[PDB]
Amino acid sequence: GPGSMVDVIIYTRPGCPYCARAKALLARKGAEFNEIDASATPELRAEMQERSGRNTFPQIFIGSVHVGGCDDLYALEDEGKLDSLLKTGKLI
């Protein structure tokens, strides 16, 4: 259909190196995404960190699936599949 694009959202916090790198990496390819803070609140940071199971990491939501973080972004960009993930909004 006329409009091969999906809504992308990213959750990060002030003072996150691994997060910034991810955001820039996604912006480099030209992938637009909404930058939102998580540390802003306990719940926003809890639900996010609860998805990964660690202290705190960058969340990359593409389409209807949750990519991951700097690891998923770096691991995906290595294969060049992310381009299709942001275009289709789903996992092959």
CATH architecture assignment, domain 1-92: 3-Layer(aba) Sandwich (3.40)
Among 34, 39, 42, which Cα is nearest to 13's? 39
Answer for the pair 26, 12: CB distance below 8 angstroms, yes or no.
no
8-12 and 34-37 as β-strands: parallel, antiparallel, unpaired?
parallel
- Residue 8, beta-bridge partner list: 62
Task: Please identify which residue in the block is written with the tokens 């694009």.
Answer: 5
Cα distances from 33 to residues 13, 19, 23, 54, 86, in angstroms, run 15, 13, 8, 23, 10
CA count, 13 A, side-chain hemisphere, 34: 9
Task: Please identify which residue in the block is written with the tokens 């990213």.
Answer: 10
Angle at 84 (CA atoms; ends 88, 5), nearest 5 degrees: 40
Distance CA 37, CA 62 (A): 17
Name the structure determination technique: NMR
- Residue 59, beta-bridge partner list: 11
